[PDB]
Amino acid sequence: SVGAIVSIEKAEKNFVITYASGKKAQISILNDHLFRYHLDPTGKFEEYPTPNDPKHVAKITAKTMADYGTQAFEQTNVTDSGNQFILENNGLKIIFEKESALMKVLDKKKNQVILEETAPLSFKNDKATQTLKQSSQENYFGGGTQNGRFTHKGTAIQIVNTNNWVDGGVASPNPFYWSTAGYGVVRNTWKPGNYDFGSHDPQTTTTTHEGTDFDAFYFFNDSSAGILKDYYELTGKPALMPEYGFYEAHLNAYNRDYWVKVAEGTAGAVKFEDGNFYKEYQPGDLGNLNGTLESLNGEKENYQFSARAVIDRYKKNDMPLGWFLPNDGYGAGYGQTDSLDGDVQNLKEFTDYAQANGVEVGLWTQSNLHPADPKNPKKGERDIAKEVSVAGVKALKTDVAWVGYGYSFGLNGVEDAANVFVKETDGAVRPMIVSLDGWAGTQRHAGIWTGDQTGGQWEYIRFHIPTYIGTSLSGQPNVGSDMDGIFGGKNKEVNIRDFQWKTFTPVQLNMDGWGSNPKTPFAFDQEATDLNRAYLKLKSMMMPYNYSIAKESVDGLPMVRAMALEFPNEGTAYTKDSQYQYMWGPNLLVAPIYNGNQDEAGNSIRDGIYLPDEKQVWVDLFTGEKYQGGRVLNGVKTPLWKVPVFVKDGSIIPMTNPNNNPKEIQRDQRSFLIYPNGATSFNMYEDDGISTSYEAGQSATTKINSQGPKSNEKGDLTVTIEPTKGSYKDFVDERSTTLDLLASEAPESVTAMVGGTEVTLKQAANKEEFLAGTNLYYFDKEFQVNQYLSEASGEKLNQSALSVKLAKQSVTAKDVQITVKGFINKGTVDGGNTTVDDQLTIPANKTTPSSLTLQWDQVATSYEVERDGTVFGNIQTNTATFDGFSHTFRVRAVGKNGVSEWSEPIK
Ligand SMILES: CC(=O)N[C@@H]1[C@@H](O)[C@@H](O)[C@@H](CO)O[C@H]1O
Ligand SMILES: [Ca+2]
- Residue 328 CB less than 6 A away from ligand 1: yes
124: containing domain = 1-222
Same domain, yes or no: 200 and 249:
no
In degrees and rounded to multiples of 5, residue 165 shows phi and psi of -100, 0
Q: Write the CA distances from 854 to 185, 883, 890, 907, integer angstroms.
A: 42, 12, 10, 10
Question: Ligand 2 centre from 691 Cα, in Å?
Answer: 32
Q: What is the DSSP pairing of strand 127-133 with strand 112-122?
A: antiparallel
Torsion on CA atoms 793, 794, 800, 804, rounded to nearest 10: 80
Same domain, yes or no: 232 and 184:
no
**Which of 655, 648, 640 has its CA nearest to residue 582?**
648
Domain stops at, among 770, 804, 827? 827
Q: What is the DSSP pairing of strand 84-88 with strand 77-80?
A: antiparallel
Residues in the chain: 907
**Which of 324, 376, 371, 370 has its CA nearest to residue 350?**
324
Q: How far apart are CA 506 and CA 512, in angstroms?
A: 19
Q: How far apart are CA 555 and CA 560, in angstroms?
A: 14
Question: Ligand 2 centre from 364 Cα, in Å?
Answer: 14
Q: Whose atoms come closest to the Cα of 256: which ligand?
A: 2
Q: Whose atoms come closest to the Cα of 305: which ligand?
A: 2
**Which residues in the chain precede a discontinuity of more than 2.5 Å between C and N?**
845, 859, 886
Q: How far apart are CA 388 and CA 418, in angstroms?
A: 11
- Return left, alpha or beta for 406; rule: phi > 0 is left, psi -120 to 50 is alpha, else beta: left
Same domain, yes or no: 263 and 376:
yes
The answer to whether residues 827 and 625 touch, using CB atoms and an 8 Å cutoff, is: yes
- Residue 364 CB less than 6 A away from ligand 1: yes
- Residue 511 CB less than 6 A away from ligand 1: yes
- Residue 362 CB less than 6 A away from ligand 1: no
Same domain, yes or no: 770 and 791:
yes
Q: Which atom of ligand 1 is nearest to the CA of 253?
A: 12
Q: Write the CA distances from 549 to 95, 371, 402, 665, integer angstroms.
A: 39, 39, 31, 18
Domain stops at, among 594, 615, 649? 649
Q: How far apart are CA 155 and CA 149, in angstroms?
A: 10
Q: Whose atoms come closest to the Cα of 296: which ligand?
A: 2
Same domain, yes or no: 53 and 182:
yes
Same domain, yes or no: 837 and 814:
no
The β-bridge partners of 45 are: none
Same domain, yes or no: 493 and 573:
no
In one-letter notation, the amino acid at residue 376 is: N
> Could you give the number of structural domains in the chain?
5
Q: In the 3-class helix/strand/coil scheme, how is 786-811 assigned residue by residue?
A: CHHHHHHHCCCCCEEEEEEEEEEEEC
Angle formed by the axes of helices 526-541 and 543-553, to 10°?
A: 60
46 Cβ neighbours under 8 A, 6+ residues apart: none
The helix or strand, by DSSP H or E, that contains position 668, with its residue range, turns out to be: none
The arrangement of strands across the sheet holding 645-648 comes to: 560-561, 582-584, 588-590, 645-648, 617-620, 626-628, 829-830
Question: Ligand 1 centre from 401 Cα, in Å?
Answer: 8
Angle formed by the axes of helices 492-502 and 526-541, to 10°?
A: 10
The arrangement of strands across the sheet holding 762-763 comes to: 652-655, 669-674, 734-742, 799-810, 776-783, 762-763
Angle formed by the axes of helices 307-316 and 340-356, to 10°?
A: 10
**Which of 544, 506, 803, 559 has its CA nearest to residue 683?**
544
Domain stops at, among 827, 845, 869? 827
**Which of 586, 494, 500, 482 has its CA nearest to residue 537?**
500
Same domain, yes or no: 636 and 677:
no
* C-alpha radius of gyration, the chain, whole number: 29
Q: Which atom of ligand 1 is nearest to the CA of 364?
A: 9
Same domain, yes or no: 486 and 581:
no
Q: Whose atoms come closest to the Cα of 292: which ligand?
A: 2
Same domain, yes or no: 252 and 214:
no
- Residue 399 CB less than 6 A away from ligand 1: yes
User: Would you call 329 helix, strand, or coil by DSSP?
Assistant: coil
**Residue whose CA lies nearest to ligand 1 atom number 12:** 329
The answer to whether residues 129 and 137 touch, using CB atoms and an 8 Å cutoff, is: no
Mutate to test the pocket of ligand 1, among 400, 512, 519 (most ligand atoms within 8 A of CB): 400
**Which of 214, 126, 138 has its CA nearest to residue 177?**
138
Same domain, yes or no: 709 and 602:
no
In one-letter notation, the amino acid at residue 81 is: S
Alpha helices in 139-261 (DSSP H): 224-235
The β-bridge partners of 360 are: 323
The answer to whether residues 554 and 237 touch, using CB atoms and an 8 Å cutoff, is: yes
Q: How far apart are CA 9 and CA 646, in angstroms?
A: 57
- Residue 486 CB less than 6 A away from ligand 1: yes
Q: In the 3-class helix/strand/coil scheme, how is 279-300 assigned residue by residue?
A: EEECHHHCCCCCCEECCCCCCC
Question: Ligand 1 centre from 476 Cα, in Å?
Answer: 21
Same domain, yes or no: 857 and 820:
no
User: Would you call 160 helix, strand, or coil by DSSP?
Assistant: coil
